[PDB]
Amino acid sequence: ESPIGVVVSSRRNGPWAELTLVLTPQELDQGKRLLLGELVRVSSGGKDYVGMVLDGYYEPVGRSDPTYTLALAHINQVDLEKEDPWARKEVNFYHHRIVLLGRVVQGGLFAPSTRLLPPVVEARVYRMTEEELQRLLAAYAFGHLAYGLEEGGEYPEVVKEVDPALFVGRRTANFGKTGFGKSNENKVILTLLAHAFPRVGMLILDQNAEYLLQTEATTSPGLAQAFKALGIRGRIRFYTAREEAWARRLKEHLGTEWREYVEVLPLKVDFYHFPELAVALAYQRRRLQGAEPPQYLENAFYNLEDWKHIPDRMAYVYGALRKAGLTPRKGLKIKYKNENYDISEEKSWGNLQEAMKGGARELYSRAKVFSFLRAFHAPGKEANFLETIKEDLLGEKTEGEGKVVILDLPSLGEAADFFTLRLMDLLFDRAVELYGKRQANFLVVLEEAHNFLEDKAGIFYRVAKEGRKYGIGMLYSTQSPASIPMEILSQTENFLVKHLSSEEDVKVLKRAKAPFAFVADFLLSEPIIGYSYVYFEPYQPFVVPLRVKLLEHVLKSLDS
Amino acid sequence: ESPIGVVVSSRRNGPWAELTLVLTPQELDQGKRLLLGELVRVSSGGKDYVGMVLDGYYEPVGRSDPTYTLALAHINQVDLEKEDPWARKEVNFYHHRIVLLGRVVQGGLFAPSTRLLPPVVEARVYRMTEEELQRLLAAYAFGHLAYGLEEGGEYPEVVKEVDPALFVGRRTANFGKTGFGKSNENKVILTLLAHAFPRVGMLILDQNAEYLLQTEATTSPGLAQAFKALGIRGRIRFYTAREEAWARRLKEHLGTEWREYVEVLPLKVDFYHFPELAVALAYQRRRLQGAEPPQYLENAFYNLEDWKHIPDRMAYVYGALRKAGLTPRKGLKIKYKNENYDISEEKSWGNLQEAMGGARELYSRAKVFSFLRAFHAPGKEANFLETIKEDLLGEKTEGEGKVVILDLPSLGEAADFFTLRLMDLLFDRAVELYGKRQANFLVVLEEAHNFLEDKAGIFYRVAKEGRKYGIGMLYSTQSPASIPMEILSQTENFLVKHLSSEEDVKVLKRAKAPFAFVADFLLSEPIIGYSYVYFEPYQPFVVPLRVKLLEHVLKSLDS
DNA sequence: GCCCTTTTGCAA
DNA sequence: TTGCAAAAGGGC
Ligand SMILES: Nc1ncnc2c1ncn2[C@@H]1O[C@H](COP(=O)(O)OP(=O)(O)NP(=O)(O)O)[C@@H](O)[C@H]1O
Ligand SMILES: Nc1ncnc2c1ncn2[C@@H]1O[C@H](COP(=O)(O)OP(=O)(O)NP(=O)(O)O)[C@@H](O)[C@H]1O
Structure with missing residues (x-):
């Protein structure tokens, strides 16, 4: 209810406004602290801004020699917190730097940065409440706000929810090192969408044979098991050339009624x-x-x-x-x-x-x-x-039906690339032909996208450029921003970034989106599995750190 | 059990947190010092962090003129220690920089770095004990902790152990200039894995013809001799186009019963x-x-x-x-x-x-x-090709574990095509077997810069997709700059020996951030067998180890 | 990776 | 008998 510290300076540092905050011995003795990367409220001139804590350093305040005082206390062996309160009270200050990102206006829109620099005497900084953070995120949880791995830096009640307006018709990029949660993130989003909004179709191009059945302890379970757990029947269409092996496999894990959940079809x-x-x-x-x-x-x-x-x-x-x-x-x-x-x-x-003849x-x-x-x-x-899939995804029967078409690419051997290109071309042509009558309303799930978005004359490049008009969303994962063309990266709307070890990757990321310049240091030095930085346009045009949910926990919790 | 010095400042420098420590005249007289690169404990707010000593410099404390004081004492033939104890107490200070690597979580995983910057009155620095270091490294020894060649930085009882969880399904990079121990390190790790965890298979692409037999003094012995010494039988499958010559050599150097250890098969x-x-x-x-x-x-x-x-x-x-x-x-x-x-x-x-x-x-x-x-x-x-496929991914070969070694030179100019074909076939089979058995084998390749680039990206695909199927990579290249960043950015384990070039250390730092703390040691300390190791996410910090010779490892293990 | 050069059939 | 196509190897 009160300001955390006192503002002592402010300036424009490039395209952003920054201010300096000081924490005093009393506040430090009360246990008050500011975490790096934490979001705070800034009151200036009757207006509220969102700010981020960027830096923190120690600096002497007033006329004092902290080094000499502390060294003398150590030499003479005096407990500084019990024998010399006045010596402890003149060195226990601390400095923080806070950047202003923008402010919320009218119907939840965001005004970025600012042209007005706040005078020091009339600027206040406040800790943000859970209600304020919930409003910030909002205007079926997928993750919850977290700051690193600190205790007290986790907010399980502040969540980001899945919504078809976020994903359908828009491009989403999933980046991160190998083993840090890209596929789990994708599967959680897809399961929540299928459960909550049953009129959205999915076209999953499975290149690793993991999105239908997955039993090894090296990834999250598959969509078939998730749908069986959540009681979703008659919505999966699996295309494969090993229709007997997959039929045998499905019966051990989904039981004797597996046909109620999955429909196996041949690619011949x-x-x-x-x-x-x-x-x-x-x-x-x-x-x-x-x-x-x-x-x-x-x-x-x-x-x-x-x-x-x-x-x-x-x-x-x-x-x-x-x-x-x-x-x-x-x-x-x-x-x-x-x-x-x-x-x-x-x-x-x-x-x-x-x-x-x-x-x-x-x-x-x-x-x-x-x-x-x-x-x-x-x-x-x-x-x-080919036609079967065409009416699975764009059939006039749907007008909202929900169809999860999973393609088992490996079973095709060396014809998979040609088959994928032909199918994408057919689907895009049909979607263009139906413009003005119905919307496509489906999402293309694409793993290792760097192999599909390379050439500018490709059908996948054309889809990434022009699917928003016809209602086709794309969700692509690549493990490395540097693998994707800058033209696609700059036009992408949503970003979900896990740990990246390379400096070039973070440089490319911040060169594509300016606000991603404030988390590159965290990304470079914090290898945490399942910790994402999320960015959505146009309602949340700033980066937020989310702790993402395991699919097993999501399934065990959605039964309530 | 007492703090070494006094913390006088703290800050955030780049992606890390640093603090400044001051050593006082009494502690300097008692003989207490801090080595560069030493690991220490930092206590703050009831929490313990691991820190590393990065820097050290002399700075004046208070309102004093050390240069004038010392020069005057030297001129006037004044022995400070015995004659002017008071003038020697105002100049005998020293400064150190300590970086906070992270926080160890008991019953949990190491937490890297920190978002909470300690106030200067509440931070203490302690020396780390042998039990603490052993616990830190724990979370069949392969090397032991050591700080340079300085006396007192040697800890034979603090060791890093070989574990299949560190190597199976993961990528390990081995760097260092010629003659510093990359092959010895590889052989020690592989021998320990074969001895202790016989359920792991290996596919070695021997481009130099040194991993089966090695009788010269320019390197350590081979896997066949190590297995004969340790009594490991019926696990090596050797493929070559010089079957007669290799059989003669094997008989000569292993005796009459060599066929109980090595099985030789043709590449025709x-x-x-x-x-x-x-x-x-x-x-x-x-x-x-x-x-x-x-x-x-x-x-x-x-x-x-x-x-x-x-x-x-x-x-x-x-x-x-x-x-x-x-x-x-x-x-x-x-x-x-x-x-x-x-x-x-x-x-x-x-x-x-x-x-x-x-x-x-x-x-x-x-x-x-x-x-x-x-x-x-x-x-x-x-x-x-089918025989190798069955050896590595067989229905019944699961368990026993098999060590396949390929004598690449004997194929001349067909080795490139053979290797690409074999890797593509093995990866396709492993993908097809997903859900019934895990591949769980390690691809070992020296001179990796000659392999990790090719049309159709077979090795790129292996590196970027083998984690799911339990296919590990162990590649030695001898120069980080020769490896693409696409493959450097997916590596979890690092083992680095002395590097002379500046661009090598720069590339290594750009690929993995913590290695920015040891680049200056690497540039200026050419020690043979001294390795900096890093393991994600169990040990996400660089630890300096002295590695063992395979000759000594064999004698230690025989008992 | 891309731009010549050849054997082979169908014509008129 | 030659022009024209179409697939394939070779030179750059
Ligand atoms: N949110 C999470 N919380 C906890 N553990 C997680 C989380 N996400 C992933 N993991 C762990 O990470 C493992 C691998 O996850 P996975 O989704 O396959 O990552 P990935 O980015 O797809 N790796 P890859 O596809 O090979 O590049 C899982 O088996 C889990 O043990
Ligand atoms: N850990 C060690 N301790 C002591 N001596 C060692 C150690 N490692 C290597 N050596 C010595 O160094 C020599 C060369 O080792 P080696 O493993 O071949 O290095 P290398 O990295 O393979 N050089 P190269 O493969 O030719 O580029 C050995 O024959 C030993 O004499």
Whole structure:
């Protein structure tokens, strides 16, 4: 209820205003202290500012020689707190430096910095109450305010809550050394969003096989286990090429009713049912590559729909698929001229090949251009998982349904990169096509993003630049700010930063966002696991230190 | 049990907290001193911190003129000690700077640094005892605490112990200039791990041919000799292309029963027995060098399994292998059309070649297989890539623990491709096995600057993603500046010997902040076997150790 | 990493 | 017989 110290000086140091505070022997003897990085209230001219404690140093006050006095007391062996109160009362001062960050105005908005420097005689500094801190953070907890690991510097009641307005339609970056909590942070945010706001969809690109089932003691549990614990049914769609191994695994950990929580789907299709899909994939593979699809590929890409009415034209497409190595289902009848062959049988295949046009004959001749499709082909599938995912995420059925689509990238081997690029392109094109009718309203979860946001001409770069218009959020983790382009870093809205050991990383971070210049020293020298610095635009344009929650504790606590 | 001096000031300097200590005439007369780099205890507000002595200088205390006083005493032949005790009490002061490293939490983890700056009247500084130091380092000795070469800074009873939790799933950097003990440190750590925790596997990429046998006086013995000394049997798998020479050396230097300790396997295979492996290697080469595989290679890669059931396609595959220069075993027969040939004979080889599609294009582009000559040997019939994969990640090999050593020089110029292929295969298998068994093995590589850069980033991926699967890295480079910051910023354990260059210490400090406190010691103290160690997050501060010789470790352990 | 150079088929 | 395409290796 009273000022902590006395303000004795103030100035403008660069783009910020700073002031000097002095703590007296009485206040120090009452146990009053100020922690570095602590948030305080500054009253000046009838206006309230938020301030941060930056520095602290000892300096003599008045006419005194603290060194001589203390050395003499030590030499003569006098207990300074019991024999010489007046000697103890002339050296027990302490100095602090406080920077003004801005002030809260009108409807919770933040006015940054200031043009008015406060005179010393009329400036006061106050300890901030939990109600004030709660208002500061607010205008399903994910973390709570903390200062380092000091006792008394923890505020379990001051929390930052998850809210779809914070994440959907906006870009979030998750940085930190390996082993410090990026994946746990992501999973806690996603579980809270799924539990509290069930109309938000997620597209998780799982490259390490950890976001569905995770039983080893090296990470937090998976989303399937979290959803089973919280009683969330029928919201996970898992795509994989190991649909039998994963089905076996799910039954040991989710029990006999695992199908109520997870739906396993294959990443394989029958290309004798989707020749247009085969041709489109072969055509797009080269655009995603350097450049210049061939003329015989553009011709097919544009005219295969026309060809479908001509059995002679379609016979050459099926022959190209069969010659590239794709296995047909037993009893597949191909009609040529005035005869029907069974390509599944070697004798009929040879007969038709010997017995065998708008550009389809060139496609048949250059059949080895389809061999890569054999990484996706499986006879008897007839699914088109690309379209299946498209209506999972952007289907008109939703208008708010909630769909967590998890892609098991490793199972695809060396086709995963091409598959990811193609799927992202399709989803973004559909989202653009639906503009003005419905919003996408889903979040792309992207780990090790430095492999996706490198080239400016990439679909992921384009999504990061233009997803806010169409309602697509992005949440990307990289372990190192220096791995991300500065153009993306500067345009990112939300930041969640754990410990970074390198000076270059913190320099890049503060070069991207100025307010991050006040925590670089803490980041460099405090390796604490699960301790985050969070920054949100435009309502919390300043860094706040949060202690993040374990997913196990969150699950055990949300049952109440 | 009493404070050393008096604290006269404190402040925040950069990311750390410092305080100033003054030593008085009585304490200086009693002989009490503080060594630079010594660890002390700081008591403040009922809490104990660990501090390090960083600086020391002489400064006048009070209103005095030490220069004039001392000069006058020297001029007037005045012996201060015996004649003027009062003039000697006003000049005999000394100053020290102490940095607060952090706070030890009993029943908990060390808390680094501090946000609370101590007032100068409430801080005390104490000397740390042997029990306190032992407790600090505890949270099979590998080294013992030592401060320089000064007498009284030697603590043989305060030791740092090898623990699998410090090394498995983590990265350890070993730096130092030539001849200062990096290889000895590596061998001591590996021998202690093998002896005490036999459930950890190792993959050593021996680029210098020193980790199996070492009989010269220019380095310490090898792992085979250490294991023979300690009685460890049936744990070393040695792969080489010089099997006969290495068997002769092993017999000569380990006796007749050397086969109970080392099992020697070749790095050669018969490609007429593994045509699918030949095609896979040819296909993976392009990706490993950053390019995109051609259509005729993707066709074979995806379709050779089907082709194996068609003798007409298999004839072209074998013809391509024979055209590339791969020697078949004596008496091999082909079955082109409904006829049989003997490609091992130069007559029927030409007969088939003149008597002669996906396989036809492979036969026409046969020169794509010539590099396989580096690994081909007729009549071998054992896939060494699969054998190594089973050794490191087997269903039953889990537990026992296996030490695989790769004799890289014997492969000549194919070693780079072999190493990249093996690492990619092992990482893919480890990722696929996530949830059923943990990899739990340590990749050991010397001259790491030659490995930690390549197209497709295989070693970058291993370093940045191996923690989840329990894949540890132990890489020695001899110069920090030669390691990318992308990999330096993900390292947890550091072991640094003397570095002469200024840029080396600057890079090390930029990579890990606390190493700013020992850079000046490193720059000016060339001591062999003196290592500064740092372990996150159990010991997040630099501790100076004297490391043991493997020769002495073996004698100590034999009992 | 990117810009020549070659064998091979389809045409007219 | 030559122009034109298309895939692939080699030189820079
Ligand atoms: N908030 C937290 N509180 C306590 N322990 C935590 C917290 N977050 C993470 N951990 C611990 O850190 C371990 C690894 O967490 P993890 O989420 O995998 O970090 P990470 O940043 O993803 N490492 P990586 O993905 O390899 O770069 C967990 O198994 C926990 O033991
Ligand atoms: N801890 C130690 N105590 C005493 N002598 C040691 C110690 N470590 C190394 N030496 C001596 O130094 C020599 C060289 O050791 P070594 O381990 O090969 O250093 P190095 O770092 O590997 N030099 P290099 O690998 O050639 O760049 C040994 O043969 C010993 O004579």
